[PDB]
Write an enzyme that holds these catalytic residues in place. Sequence first.
Site, PDB file in Angstrom:
ATOM      1  N   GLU A 194       0.853  -1.187   0.000  1.00  0.00           N
ATOM      2  CA  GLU A 194       0.000   0.000   0.000  1.00  0.00           C
ATOM      3  C   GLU A 194       0.884   1.229   0.000  1.00  0.00           C
ATOM      4  OE1 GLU A 194      -4.161  -0.635   2.327  1.00  0.00           O
ATOM      5  OE2 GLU A 194      -2.446  -1.585   3.315  1.00  0.00           O
ATOM      6  N   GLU A 195       1.774   1.292   0.988  1.00  0.00           N
ATOM      7  CA  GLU A 195       2.817   2.307   1.071  1.00  0.00           C
ATOM      8  C   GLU A 195       3.407   2.563  -0.312  1.00  0.00           C
ATOM      9  OE1 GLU A 195       5.224   1.139   4.375  1.00  0.00           O
ATOM     10  OE2 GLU A 195       6.539   2.915   4.247  1.00  0.00           O
TER      11      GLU A 195
END
Lengths: 591, 591, 100
Positions: free
Chosen positions: B200-201
């Site tokens: 996600e990061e």
Amino acid sequence: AETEKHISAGKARLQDLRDAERRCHDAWQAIVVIDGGSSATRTNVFLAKTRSCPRGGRHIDPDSIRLLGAGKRFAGLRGVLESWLDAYAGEDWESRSVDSKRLFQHVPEMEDSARGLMQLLEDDAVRILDEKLTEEQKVQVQAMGVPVLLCSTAGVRDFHDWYREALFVILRFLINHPKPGHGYKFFTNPEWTRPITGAEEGLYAFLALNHLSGRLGEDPARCYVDEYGMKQCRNDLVGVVEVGGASTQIVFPLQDGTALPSSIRAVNLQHERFLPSRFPSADVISVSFMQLGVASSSGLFFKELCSNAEFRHQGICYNPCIFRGFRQACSAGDVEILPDGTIVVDEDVRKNKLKPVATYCSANNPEISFKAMNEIQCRVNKIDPTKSLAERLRIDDCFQIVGTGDFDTCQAQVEELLVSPRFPLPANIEAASSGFESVGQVFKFASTASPMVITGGAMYASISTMQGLGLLPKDFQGDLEQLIAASRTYCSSPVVNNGDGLVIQLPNAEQKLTSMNYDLCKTIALTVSLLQHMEAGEHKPSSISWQKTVVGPDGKPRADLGWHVGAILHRVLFTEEWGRTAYETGFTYNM
Amino acid sequence: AETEKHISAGKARLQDLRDAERRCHDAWQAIVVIDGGSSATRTNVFLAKTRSCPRGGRHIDPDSIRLLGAGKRFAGLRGVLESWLDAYAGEDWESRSVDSKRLFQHVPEMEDSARGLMQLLEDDAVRILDEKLTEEQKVQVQAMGVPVLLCSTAGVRDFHDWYREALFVILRFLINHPKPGHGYKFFTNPEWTRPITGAEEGLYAFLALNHLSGRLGEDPARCYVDEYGMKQCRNDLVGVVEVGGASTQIVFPLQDGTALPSSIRAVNLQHERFLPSRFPSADVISVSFMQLGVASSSGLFFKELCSNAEFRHQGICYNPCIFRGFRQACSAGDVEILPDGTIVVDEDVRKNKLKPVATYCSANNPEISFKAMNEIQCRVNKIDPTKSLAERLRIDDCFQIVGTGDFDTCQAQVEELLVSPRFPLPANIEAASSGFESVGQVFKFASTASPMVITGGAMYASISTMQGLGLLPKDFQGDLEQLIAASRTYCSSPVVNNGDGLVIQLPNAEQKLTSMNYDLCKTIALTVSLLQHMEAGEHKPSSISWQKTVVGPDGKPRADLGWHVGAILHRVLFTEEWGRTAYETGFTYNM
Amino acid sequence: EWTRPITGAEEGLYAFLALNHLSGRLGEDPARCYVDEYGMKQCRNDLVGVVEVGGASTQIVFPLQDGTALPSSIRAVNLQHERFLPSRFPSADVISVSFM
């Protein structure tokens, strides 16, 4: 073992917090509607609860709308515009031709004039909020923003040129700039704050009635399968009759098998953008008659009755709709009853029951020179546009109007001259209107089986005071037999002075004669007439009632009937659009 | 003709008032994103404009997003969970069995630590807001509500049972209850404030970079018609490599006609809901490798290297990525250089480069119990779960690591051990992840032709540090021969303890030696490897650059690259959802 | 879109649909509609699970249980999201495997 209750309490504290971010939370919100009538403009403060859920936005629970309080009567918008035009547009803007472009010079004086009225309405609402809200509600109301809908009715509909449009831009501006001190963040926009036509007033009263009585739920009332194998969802909506000062509106549901004439149309609330698609399709007949208002009808009745030589013997006009004992100067001027017994009639043309119809039937009005026909149509109603204002407002050869108190004749005349005249004054064509020219035509051609309710200050009161008199039964439901018998007794009561002022000697009471009741039988006759036409149509209303306030599930009053909560529902039932305008753009737009 | 300027003064006032209710108005809004990293928690304050139109909602102009200021470094989330656990969980709880049920006793203590941390956080944001906003902006920001998204990165991923989830509920509760004094209506929800995975990061970094470069506009960049006569619209998006402390993320657009192994899949930004549907479909390759990333790579490297006999002689380990003249104790503990140049190594388990991996590879972790096969991979990468934590981090009979400052071998080892091991550490399996296990696999099987940008403090420093010593050109763009040339001369420099506590002696200058740059050469080696695979892959990136800040062609400072802006965009680009959750629901929900 | 190779797991998801529809458990309307602890309107279907053991493979597909915690290596298959059931049907969260 006690290091076990600490575990359960820790499991609970986690659960409360989880629980708090998961369910919907409710907040209080105020909504004010400002009524701009002919004679006055005053504020009405409403309260409702909003609800928002984690995903999804914010909506008003419509079931939660309640009237908090109506305010003090302040100056009418007409009377504001008139002060402005008198002072700056020349002495005779009403008689002489108007030069519009010279007026732009004094817009800060109009703005200045309006700031006075808007400041007073703002303060008055703040008086009501502070008064009626709990400590808790107040801080939430302050946070949420408070929508304001200012809707003007009859008084402002006649003003040509650009004046009415400039006043509303000014008005809205004043509303968008509330004083910071009190903390109620009033705001409005061009959708909410606007003039409204009589037919809109009618549609709002229609949404108000049906929703306050629980006919317009989120879910439909019934969903069967029809004679072609398809699901049909239906609401059982009630029809409404409202007689207001300036106009009478009638709005009810269409029958299923019903053939409309050409030139006549059912208005579909969904299509005309008055109710959302998620409610069953609502087709209605929707009329608004300027002749049939309490005031407008009084002036019309005066002109039409007293011009008939059958009622004007030897210089005196004998009005059957006024109590015997009542003598009056012969005009449609504002009646005033002095403390002692003197009856004075106002000569001021603005303070006249014929003024609205006459300024419509003016050479001034571009709706008259538009088509040569609507000049003749209203000359037939004895209001000549080529003749002056004074000649239009008066009956020649008439010295005094004298009361006769003869209901049968009053009812006959009201029937003939107002309810179903052979040549009625023009019907205003618009999205919200059906087209009919008067009542006779409505129930002849488009009658309904839907239940009916009758509303209006004088409509309600006249029946109710009869009931208190013992002249009507307490469970009265519209029987003409009883209504006519009671109407005959009531209207033949004499007006006498016992030394305490003018009174009506009823068989078992004395009722103070005011300028609101002297011709009250004209509207009783109008009731009788109206119940007759409803009885004679192909379809008859399943039941009929007279209503004014509607009471809550708790047993205590929610709101009054009329267009106010209709104006609210018109905006509020559209959840996604309201979410955007009220909460997303909202009061922060004003920054 | 004299006061004809008074007519135009009045005209203009109306048009201005009209203008002011037909036009869209902008209001300033702050969003704060709180970076919950493995070693610290830092608040980041952002300022954006909102626009609001009548007959519409309110949206954020995503171009107007600016970084206002990053805060002080407070306690990492791992930290508070570890202090709490140490206090109340069983002694040596990381060694021992869980029995989590009794821990609930001390929920109010978890709530005590969290409140301490969040009120510091809150205050910090307020400090920055007060300091950087103009007074005009400050009034609007108080009024608008201030979205806060707290996203925990690594260091909190590998906690089991209920502990982490409960902390977040508490975290959210605290954010949703700011001090009324400062008037910044901070708020958050379960969708914004949450733990986010490596991938996600990475997807956030993609969005940030691509939006800030001006490649993610409302309109598509090209629209053509393909061989089948279909209307196509596409965006020319850039790919990102972010190599950070805990992990390394590669995210780039999928190439036109790639055939992916059945074990691998493209991540679509629309379907997974990271980009709205109105944007051209974004098909992406997206990976996050815990084995890479500076800290975890340095741990794993040590374990593999000092277990190879090619680099061990007696009790000494020969590391080619550390400068000649550098000598430290043989472990993966946190190197510290004391004021006089004495290299000292932390013996605390928590301050250990290898702790993250070793925590994953333990019989404690149910992910190892899950797959009897996952226990093998831990053993293969030299971290046996049968052994204790202390045995896992250690190498027996190894006492000193000495640097050999030999770039060529370093590169070769980084290549063999980290960039393309034969038996890599297990892949992350999730919606946001494509499924690859190593960098070698990525460019062998899914190479791309879109431009690439390398981001990372470690990555940027590598290039910068050499540019400051004249070893690389000021306009360096990724040329491989130039890089290795410079890389040899740099890493081959001896470090000597002067009166000055540890310094690297270059041919023409002297650089300071710190706990953060003694093994810089490893991450230089990383750079060389990276470009090598990118050149060798079937498709080749059109260009390559190094970036940290985006500035805007106009003047300077806009925002810093990384996931922060992506956290914002993920929510804000969805106009109608953002309006509901930020403006309709918003902070009023919290009352 | 119709004529194509299908994977074991698909074969399995198809079996689920067939069985559930033919049992009368996949109607146009949901089977129950209640209101949960948070006051939310919930509609659900009481769907049955299938094990098909065939020549080439064995498929197990069943509804995911109310409060399951799945290993980070494992994920629920949602029939709407993956586009195997339209959105007007109550969300179908499923465990679905095909073992060669």
